[PDB]
Amino acid sequence: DSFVAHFREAAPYIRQMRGTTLVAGIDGRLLEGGTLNKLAADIGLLSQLGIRLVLIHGAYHFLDRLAAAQGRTPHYCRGLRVTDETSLGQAQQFAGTVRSRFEAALCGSSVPLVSGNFLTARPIGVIDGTDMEYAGVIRKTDTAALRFQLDAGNIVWMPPLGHSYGGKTFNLDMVQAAASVAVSLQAEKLVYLTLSDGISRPDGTLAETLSAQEAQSLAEHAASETRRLISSAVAALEGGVHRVQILNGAADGSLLQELFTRNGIGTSIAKEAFVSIRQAHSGDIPHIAALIRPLEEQGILLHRSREYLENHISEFSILEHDGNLYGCAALKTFAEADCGEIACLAVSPQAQDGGYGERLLAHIIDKARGIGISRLFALSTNTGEWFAERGFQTASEDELPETRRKDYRSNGRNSHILVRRLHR
Amino acid sequence: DSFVAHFREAAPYIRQMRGTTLVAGIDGRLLEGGTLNKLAADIGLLSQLGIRLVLIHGAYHFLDRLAAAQGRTPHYCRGLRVTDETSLGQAQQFAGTVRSRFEAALCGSSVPLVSGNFLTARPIGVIDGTDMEYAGVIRKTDTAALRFQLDAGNIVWMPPLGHSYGGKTFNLDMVQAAASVAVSLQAEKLVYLTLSDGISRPDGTLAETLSAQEAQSLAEHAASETRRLISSAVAALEGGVHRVQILNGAADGSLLQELFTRNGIGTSIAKEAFVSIRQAHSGDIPHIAALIRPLEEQGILLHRSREYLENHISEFSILEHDGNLYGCAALKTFAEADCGEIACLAVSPQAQDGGYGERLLAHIIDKARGIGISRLFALSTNTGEWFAERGFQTASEDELPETRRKDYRSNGRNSHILVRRLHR
Amino acid sequence: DSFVAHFREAAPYIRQMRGTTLVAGIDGRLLEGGTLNKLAADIGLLSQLGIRLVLIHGAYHFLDRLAAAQGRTPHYCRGLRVTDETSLGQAQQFAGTVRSRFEAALCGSSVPLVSGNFLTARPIGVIDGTDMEYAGVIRKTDTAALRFQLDAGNIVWMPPLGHSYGGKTFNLDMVQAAASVAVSLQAEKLVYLTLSDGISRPDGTLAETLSAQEAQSLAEHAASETRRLISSAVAALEGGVHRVQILNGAADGSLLQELFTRNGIGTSIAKEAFVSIRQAHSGDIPHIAALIRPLEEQGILLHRSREYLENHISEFSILEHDGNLYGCAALKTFAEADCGEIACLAVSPQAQDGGYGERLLAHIIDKARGIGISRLFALSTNTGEWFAERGFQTASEDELPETRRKDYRSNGRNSHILVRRLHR
Amino acid sequence: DSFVAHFREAAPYIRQMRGTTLVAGIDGRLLEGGTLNKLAADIGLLSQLGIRLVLIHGAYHFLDRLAAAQGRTPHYCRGLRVTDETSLGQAQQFAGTVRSRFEAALCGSSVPLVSGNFLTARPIGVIDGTDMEYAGVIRKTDTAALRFQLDAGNIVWMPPLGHSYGGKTFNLDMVQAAASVAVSLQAEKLVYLTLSDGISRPDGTLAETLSAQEAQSLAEHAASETRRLISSAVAALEGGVHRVQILNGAADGSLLQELFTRNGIGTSIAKEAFVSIRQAHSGDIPHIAALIRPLEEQGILLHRSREYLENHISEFSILEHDGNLYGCAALKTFAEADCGEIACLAVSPQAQDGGYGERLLAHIIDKARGIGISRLFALSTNTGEWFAERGFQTASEDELPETRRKDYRSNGRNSHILVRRLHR
Ligand SMILES: CC(=O)SCCNC(=O)CCNC(=O)[C@@H](O)C(C)(C)COP(=O)(O)OP(=O)(O)OC[C@H]1O[C@@H](n2cnc3c(N)ncnc32)[C@H](O)[C@@H]1OP(=O)(O)O
Ligand SMILES: CC(=O)SCCNC(=O)CCNC(=O)[C@@H](O)C(C)(C)COP(=O)(O)OP(=O)(O)OC[C@H]1O[C@@H](n2cnc3c(N)ncnc32)[C@H](O)[C@@H]1OP(=O)(O)O
Ligand SMILES: CC(=O)SCCNC(=O)CCNC(=O)[C@@H](O)C(C)(C)COP(=O)(O)OP(=O)(O)OC[C@H]1O[C@@H](n2cnc3c(N)ncnc32)[C@H](O)[C@@H]1OP(=O)(O)O
Ligand SMILES: CC(=O)SCCNC(=O)CCNC(=O)[C@@H](O)C(C)(C)COP(=O)(O)OP(=O)(O)OC[C@H]1O[C@@H](n2cnc3c(N)ncnc32)[C@H](O)[C@@H]1OP(=O)(O)O
């Protein structure tokens, strides 16, 4: 396509990304090739787009390439690496070489790039009888110092090294340091730049998009690296990060196609907040009734009756939490097999504006869809735009299921009629 | 091309545009069609890219469409419009309709849009025996209030109306109000969104790019509208604005192809700052000598002699200002017709870092080019990167004109050799 | 009176008003006459006095004056107006004419006047079988943007128009948009500038001052306009606004006599926070005792006994909330019919400094007054200034009821004696 | 001595140092021993005292210790080092090792330590036929970014590496990078932490304190390292830095004894601003007269006469600049060989408050001292505290030289008499 079409397409993701914080965990193999200049460039552009950037790199592969050419051999414990005085010192050397190169790359094709003692570490200790030695884990992150640099527009660069109040240095594991930092910052996005195109399903298909549950249930039969990825990405979400992404940092332009297209190129994982939605049974009716009543009084919801609810309780769903009731929604069906209607959508006012509404709408569409309904109607006197913004188009009475067209004519409410199509 | 290629291409213009101020003078016919939704959209995106926006619209065409359907007829004096109480009142109505529509357009496909009493006007008075009445000209612009809103990230919307301390309103001419506002703000860019694709040359070719001089000399045989455009665009430059652009605000996506491509779609006008560059004659030598001397002393410039300068004065150019001498540069030629060399490039240290250097380099390339030289060498001990950043590639001794290869070998300076190709 | 006396009288209301936020809902008939220049002037002065101003106007009457001269006729549903595409467009025109005129008025006899997309609207929908069409209600107010402009000292101007994320405009009802905005801002004062001198009582007397209850109970027999006024003013209070005022915006200088005199010219409505105050019965004594005890221990409250409380429980009042007890206060009476004494005033320390103290004092004066007491004494060892600041003057022992003069002499406490007069 | 005496002595240097900027150029041998923990500690304390710190280290000695153990050998050109791709890469490694260790040292016995791309470099080029290769010199310092970090209280750490807009890295020479940075910042103090105790005189005595002139004239017979030190320290002063210090960064606590004692431990160099002070001859009298006159008129300066000036012109000194006259001061002598008096001290009012006054006082004391005067009197009606703050004690008439005691008695001015002692 044309430039204007590309830019206009990017446009809504530029709006989303702006003034947002992105933690990038970068595999340290990317900090070497022509993959570096490409990456530095793309990172400069993300700066220019008003994305707050915290970049973390790893050092493990560099550490093995040395451990294999020096005679010595690497030891790993749950995926963490035993690091001694020696590998520690080399990891300090690498940090410096890679910071200086990333800066020349960035500067060379000025963007403000900053680096600081933000992390205090502490040794992992001993895992499973094995002393990890100088392997560390972040103990404290100066979250205020970091925000401070990010407020000023600076890009933050972190090596995988932290210090302790004993004057020692420890080698952090990047995959879990990035997820720790993202959580502290409450970064909207954690991005893992790997050498592989996302996370594959059981039959070799790339998982475009996963819940934290589906990510979880993939790891059971996944390689160990991708299980550590998944584990960190899940804890990041759990700790508040809104979205983690896995990309191939080696594939040219990937970061940009990730962030700024509907499509993308790796894997994106998000967590579902909890919402018990179930079939109403008849113990809910007083609960439903008291929710629904003042809305009927207000002219918002169709005059009902309790005996209706009792004989139609099977078409209701309720949303709850700690056994209290925060939402309801009904599915009506018609002589026409292809039609349904969502009716009686209602969220407790104190619990409004958190997405309960939506969650109930979604659940009614899944219900509709499982019985072969492809057209969902909503008739609303006072609430149509809510459905208009959520996929519903305007319709006519002459468009209703025939008996609904009747009720509508005789109810006198003159509500606005709207439909959504639902796909197989 | 691909998305990534488009975005990577935009990238350096996103860097230029960012935190920069753009005044847009918008023809009020654009505020009506599907040209409005397209424009509002593109303007929202420029916001999202961190461009400070001041938008001004005109009302003249709306005013005539009324003046032609109401019976009355428009009168114009130098291109300014006589506006009475009545047309004044309609122009107030239009402002409101067009502000409200631009806001619905913008909001509807939230970006912060602000509008204020920034302008105090005063009547133009009487031109050429003709009373302009309620035609106004900006008398004072609250430049601090404006910056203030722009600092906060707000987009500024202005109607073509200002008030006076007598409690009257006047109808501003948009083309010149925008240029006045841009000048007050010292906006880096003034953009005129018109219904025509830029400014045409004598044979119907679009003028991609003009100096303020070339714009000027076009207007002699130009239509009156485009002469008023040109006149305002010239005064804007003169008053400090760095770049004015003329586009077709009706052609879909034009603003975006303007700002964010090497190419573009309308006309871009810029002003040449003054620089007397001429052939040295022999009254300059003491001037050149005293400039050049301490650089030779420092090992920066080739050991010279005065008798050299006297017998080679014809290959020197000097840069001056108020009769003082701020730069010099030489062109050497060789047995090879295709070769030249820039030597003895030198700017007075007090006058450095304003582009004098560059201006002398440019002038030497134009000189070289007019005698059929296509390869310009520079040999520099201490200054090569200056030429490297300005189009010069690295070369070998074996690449020099043969006699230059000799001198080089026997001078012992071991300088870095660099060439630039020059096109016909 | 003299200038100095007027200014010195204004003075304490200038102190109250300063740095405070006032939302003004302005009837759009005022935006036309010589009532405009007068109003603009007075509003400029309120600016100069450091009052944060948000001004909203209505458009309904303008809309009818058109709907009556164009042939068409207005329809109203609960007092809201059905507005179509056409009246919508005229309402956009009016906004522009009236904003521009208010600005010329203000500027013309410079004060910073700002206007923005602060309001997102949504259609009211269908009321009572009737489609309101383009009638809107505020869905979201950019409360941060507003504060931001108000922080900088800007006066905010709002038309009665909001947009939706569908790119549509809707006509807001001013009386309820102003009350919505005031609530969002938590404005200390909402002011309705009407064409009538406040709100009349059942016999044509102007209600100077009303509780939200008394406003409420007036509306039962009130005209429909004044019932909508009252309804919005009540919800504004309920939602947190401290004071709503109704004035005649057409009566010259009214706003200034409202704000800055003890008197005023329209109607001022305020809401009573809740305080269950009742007669103690004997189930309170352990509650009273435990409150009062540590104060006796501290020398603050007269040594008592439980058998006293039991035989005098009828002279106590208690203040409660959720059945817990937060205050007590006693009324003593004397051989002298004209005398009372407030004794044993005590507020739970955790519940102090919210006006409970005062509420109990007030309730004791109402009690005293209903039995024909015109002189209330308070004898306080440690707390006299509290009574001194609340209407109590210093007195002598020789001033006490005779038997109180006795007890006082023999109790030895040497407390400070103070009286307040109470009127019929 | 006691703690309290030490702290009270430090006290006035803590006041001087506070909110002041200190650039420390650190020899990279200090970044290794137990000299590191000692230094990190002392630097943490300077932070805690509110000193803004920019720290720069060198890498040359590390580079030779490698160049001597790897086979290769170092080349130096004017003291700058030829650095190739290889040594460049090692210098990147060293930076990282030394930054990480300095941070563990500092953290380990949390103070905010920051590091950034503040420096853009460019190759030195070719010196004296010799290509320096990857040897760099700072081209641009982001002085705003630096101040920004320093404003926030952060300590700035710089390696001796900068980048260019070509994406290359270059090895800066620390001694001259520190002096460049200090000048950009206008740091009050540049401190060189070396392995030697300051700068020695011709006979092995440590130069406690030097003018930039005396530093200069030492370098003629100084070792080459100390000549480069001296040269950078002089240009730093010349460029605006107020004080440069040379210490032994290896001698325990030296930095603290430098900054915070009257004494110190290395060498401190400062520059004398220019002041032509000379003997008045008789071409000055109209100049002196016009200066002195309005002060006599004001009662500030003793009534004089021109014929006095003409016959006493030899006891006057004048201060000038571009041949204009900005100060005068006289030395009187007496029958008592041990006494002098400064009289007629006067600075042009436009040129006041820049230290001219002082410079003239100093010059008169040097004059006095060279003729064997050990007691300088000043008699001032209106100006005594100026002399009181500058070493003069209060005295009596009975203390004056006998004939001065006479004049004083008969002049009637009743001025305040003050003396200063002057040492051999
Ligand atoms: C066919 C039918 O069922 S018609 C009956 C529909 N039910 C009602 O009208 C009952 C009263 N209103 C409610 O209960 C509203 O909560 C609901 C049901 C419409 C939405 O429930 P919520 O839990 O608030 O849903 P959710 O959080 O996903 O949506 C919230 C958003 O809906 C928007 N919304 C809510 N009311 C309306 C409305 N009447 N018009 C337009 N938008 C609205 C809210 O402003 C909020 O906006 P935002 O995303 O910019 O914050
Ligand atoms: C072939 C030959 O003629 S070799 C002899 C070249 N002459 C010299 O070296 C003389 C001493 N230096 C000068 O006179 C420098 O001014 C010149 C001639 C190189 C440039 O002149 P200016 O008027 O400063 O030119 P202009 O303003 O267009 O260029 C300024 C930019 O050049 C950069 N520049 C200047 N010196 C150098 C250098 N030695 N190395 C790299 N960049 C440099 C400046 O830092 C400035 O950077 P910026 O754009 O990021 O601010
Ligand atoms: C005659 C008699 O009853 S004497 C016995 C009076 N009772 C006591 O002294 C009991 C201990 N103190 C209390 O219980 C105090 O709460 C009371 C009863 C005096 C006031 O009750 P509150 O609920 O705090 O009353 P309210 O909120 O209306 O008054 C609060 C104000 O009273 C002021 N106030 C409270 N104590 C005193 C005092 N001893 N002296 C002066 N002012 C005081 C508070 O500082 C507060 O000041 P503000 O308006 O500048 O914030
Ligand atoms: C013995 C005799 O010669 S008596 C005659 C002395 N001459 C006068 O009184 C002439 C009028 N005043 C002057 O000419 C003043 O400039 C002088 C001569 C006293 C000082 O000259 P300057 O160039 O200002 O000297 P310098 O800059 O070193 O001293 C400036 C400081 O002196 C202080 N100072 C100046 N006047 C006085 C005074 N009358 N009393 C106390 N302090 C003073 C200034 O406030 C300034 O204060 P700072 O250091 O806190 O800024």
Our CA-based measurement puts residue D163 at a distance from the nearest CA of chain A, in whole angstroms, of 6
Distance from Cα C387 to the centre of ligand 3, integer Å? 9
B416 interface with D at CB cutoff 8 Å: yes
- Residue at D359: amino acid letter: R
C164 interface with A at CB cutoff 8 Å: yes
- C279 and C421, same domain (yes or no): yes
Radius of gyration of chain A (CA): 27
Candidates D75, D78, D122, D170: best to mutate against B (most CBs of B within 10 A) is D122
Our CA-based measurement puts residue C168 at a distance from the nearest CA of chain B, in whole angstroms, of 6
**In this structure, are residues A339 and A369 in contact, taking their beta carbons and an 8 Å threshold?**
no
B312 interface with C at CB cutoff 8 Å: no
**By CB neighbour count within 10 A (0-12 exposed, 13-18 middle, 19+ buried), where does A98 fall?**
buried
Ligand-binding annotation for C345, yes or no, is yes
- A218 and A261, same domain (yes or no): yes
| Structural domain boundaries enclosing B50 | 1-274
Measure CB to CB from residue D126 to each of B385, B388, B414 and give the nearest one.
B414
- C183 and C294, same domain (yes or no): no
Measure CB to CB from residue A4 to each of B1, B49, B256 and give the nearest one.
B256
CATH number of the structural domain spanning residue C153? 3.40.1160.10
Q: Is C155 helix (H, G, I), strand (E, B) or coil?
A: strand
C143 interface with B at CB cutoff 8 Å: no
D122 interface with B at CB cutoff 8 Å: yes
Ligand-binding annotation for C339, yes or no, is no
- A267 and A397, same domain (yes or no): no
Measure CB to CB from residue B14 to each of A5, A11, A49 and give the nearest one.
A49
- B2 and B139, same domain (yes or no): yes
Q: Residue whose CA is closest, atom 4 of ligand 2?
A: B380
Q: Residue whose CA is closest, atom 30 of ligand 3?
A: C353
**Residue finishing a domain among C255, C274, C293:** C274
Rounded to 5 degrees, φ, ψ at D414 are: 65, 30
- B249 and B286, same domain (yes or no): no
**In this structure, are residues B38 and B252 in contact, taking their beta carbons and an 8 Å threshold?**
yes
Measure CB to CB from residue B11 to each of A3, A48, A261 and give the nearest one.
A48
Residues 6+ away with beta carbon under 8 Å from C233: C179, C190, C192, C212, C215, C244, C246, C269
Ligand-binding annotation for D239, yes or no, is no
**In this structure, are residues A327 and A288 in contact, taking their beta carbons and an 8 Å threshold?**
no
Chains in contact with D, where contact requires at least 3 CB pairs less than 8 Å apart: A, B
**How far, in Å, CA of B217 to CA of B221, rounded?**
8
Measure CB to CB from residue B15 to each of A4, A18, A48 and give the nearest one.
A48
**By CB neighbour count within 10 A (0-12 exposed, 13-18 middle, 19+ buried), where does D307 fall?**
exposed
Distance from Cα A343 to the centre of ligand 1, integer Å? 13
**In this structure, are residues A310 and A282 in contact, taking their beta carbons and an 8 Å threshold?**
yes
Distances (CA, A) of C9 to A153, C13, C263, D67: 52, 8, 11, 88
Our CA-based measurement puts residue C106 at a distance from the nearest CA of chain B, in whole angstroms, of 7
**In this structure, are residues B269 and B275 in contact, taking their beta carbons and an 8 Å threshold?**
no
Long-range Cβ contacts of A285-290 (<8 Å, 24+ apart): A285/A309, A285/A310, A285/A313, A287/A318, A287/A325, A288/A316, A288/A318, A288/A325, A288/A328
Tell me if A169 and D92 make a contact (CB, 8 A cut-off): no
Determine the residue of chain A that is closest to C122 in CA distance: A385
| Helix (H), strand (E) at residue A184 | helix A174-185
Tell me if C96 and B96 make a contact (CB, 8 A cut-off): yes
Q: Is C412 helix (H, G, I), strand (E, B) or coil?
A: coil
Our CA-based measurement puts residue B175 at a distance from the nearest CA of chain C, in whole angstroms, of 21
- A315 and A243, same domain (yes or no): no
- C390 and C351, same domain (yes or no): yes
Ligand 1 binding pocket includes A354 (Cβ within 6 Å): yes
**How far, in Å, CA of D258 to CA of D239, rounded?**
23
Residues 6+ away with beta carbon under 8 Å from B376: B340, B341, B342, B364, B365, B368, B392, B419, B420, B421, B422
**How far, in Å, CA of B356 to CA of B343, rounded?**
15
Distance from Cα A358 to the centre of ligand 1, integer Å? 8
Ligand 1 binding pocket includes A347 (Cβ within 6 Å): yes
| Helix (H), strand (E) at residue B291 | helix B285-298
**How far, in Å, CA of A389 to CA of C82, rounded?**
23
Measure CB to CB from residue D145 to each of A112, A120, A142 and give the nearest one.
A112
**How far, in Å, CA of C122 to CA of A169, rounded?**
58
Ligand-binding annotation for B353, yes or no, is yes
Nearest to D268 by CA among D175, D340, D177, D206: D206
Distances (CA, A) of A217 to A196, A213, D378: 20, 6, 95
Q: In what order do the strands lie in the sheet with D136-141?
A: D136-141, D119-123, D161-163, D169-171
- D232 and D257, same domain (yes or no): yes
- Residue at A270: amino acid letter: A
Chains A and D physically touch (3 or more Cβ atom pairs below 8 Å)? yes
Nearest to A383 by CA among A338, A340, A424, A352: A352
Chain breaks in chain A (C to N over 2.5 A) after: 109
Please name the residue that has the structure tokens 């009756």: A305
| Helix (H), strand (E) at residue B113 | strand B113-116
- D129 and D250, same domain (yes or no): yes
- B195 and B289, same domain (yes or no): no
Ligand 1 binding pocket includes A361 (Cβ within 6 Å): no
Nearest to C379 by CA among C349, C410, C360, C405: C405
Ligand 2 binding pocket includes B354 (Cβ within 6 Å): yes
Please name the residue that has the structure tokens 């320290």: D233
Task: Report the half-sphere exposure of B93 (CA within 13 A, side-chain side).
Answer: 14
A92 interface with D at CB cutoff 8 Å: yes
Cβ-based contacts of A145 with chain D (< 8 Å): 112
Q: What is the dihedral of CA A128, A129, A131, A136, to 10 degrees?
A: 20
CB atoms within 10 A of CB C399: 15
Distance from Cα D76 to the centre of ligand 2, integer Å? 25
CB within 8 Å of chain C, chain A residues 358-397: 380-385, 388-389
Nearest to A55 by CA among A170, A135, A160, A184: A160
Ligand-binding annotation for C133, yes or no, is no
**In this structure, are residues D280 and D318 in contact, taking their beta carbons and an 8 Å threshold?**
yes
Q: Residue whose CA is closest, atom 9 of ligand 2?
A: B383
**Residue finishing a domain among C274, C305, C332:** C274
B41 interface with C at CB cutoff 8 Å: no
| Helix (H), strand (E) at residue B393 | strand B393-394
Query: Tokens representing A420?
Result: 């959504």
Distance from Cα C384 to the centre of ligand 3, integer Å? 9
Cβ-based contacts of C161 with chain B (< 8 Å): 100
With vertex at residue C108, the alpha carbon angle to CA C103 and CA C110, rounded to the nearest 5 degrees, is 65
CB atoms within 10 A of CB A222: 18
**How far, in Å, CA of B313 to CA of B292, rounded?**
14
Chains in contact with B, where contact requires at least 3 CB pairs less than 8 Å apart: A, C, D
Ligand 4 binding pocket includes D294 (Cβ within 6 Å): no
Task: Please count the structural domains in chain C.
Answer: 2
Residues 6+ away with beta carbon under 8 Å from C72: C86
Determine the residue of chain B that is closest to C36 in CA distance: B167
Report strand pairing: A130-131 vs C267-270.
unpaired
**In this structure, are residues B91 and B84 in contact, taking their beta carbons and an 8 Å threshold?**
no
Distance from Cα D349 to the centre of ligand 4, integer Å? 10
B251 interface with A at CB cutoff 8 Å: no
Measure CB to CB from residue B383 to each of D125, D129, D131 and give the nearest one.
D125
A214 interface with D at CB cutoff 8 Å: no
Tell me if D125 and B380 make a contact (CB, 8 A cut-off): yes
A101 interface with D at CB cutoff 8 Å: yes
How many residues appear in chain D?
Answer: 424
- A135 and A25, same domain (yes or no): yes
Distinct helix (H) and strand (E) counts, chain A: 14, 23
CATH number of the structural domain spanning residue C384? 3.40.630.30
Q: Residue whose CA is closest, atom 39 of ligand 2?
A: B383
Ligand 4 binding pocket includes D277 (Cβ within 6 Å): no
**Residue finishing a domain among C213, C243, C274:** C274
**In this structure, are residues B98 and B115 in contact, taking their beta carbons and an 8 Å threshold?**
no
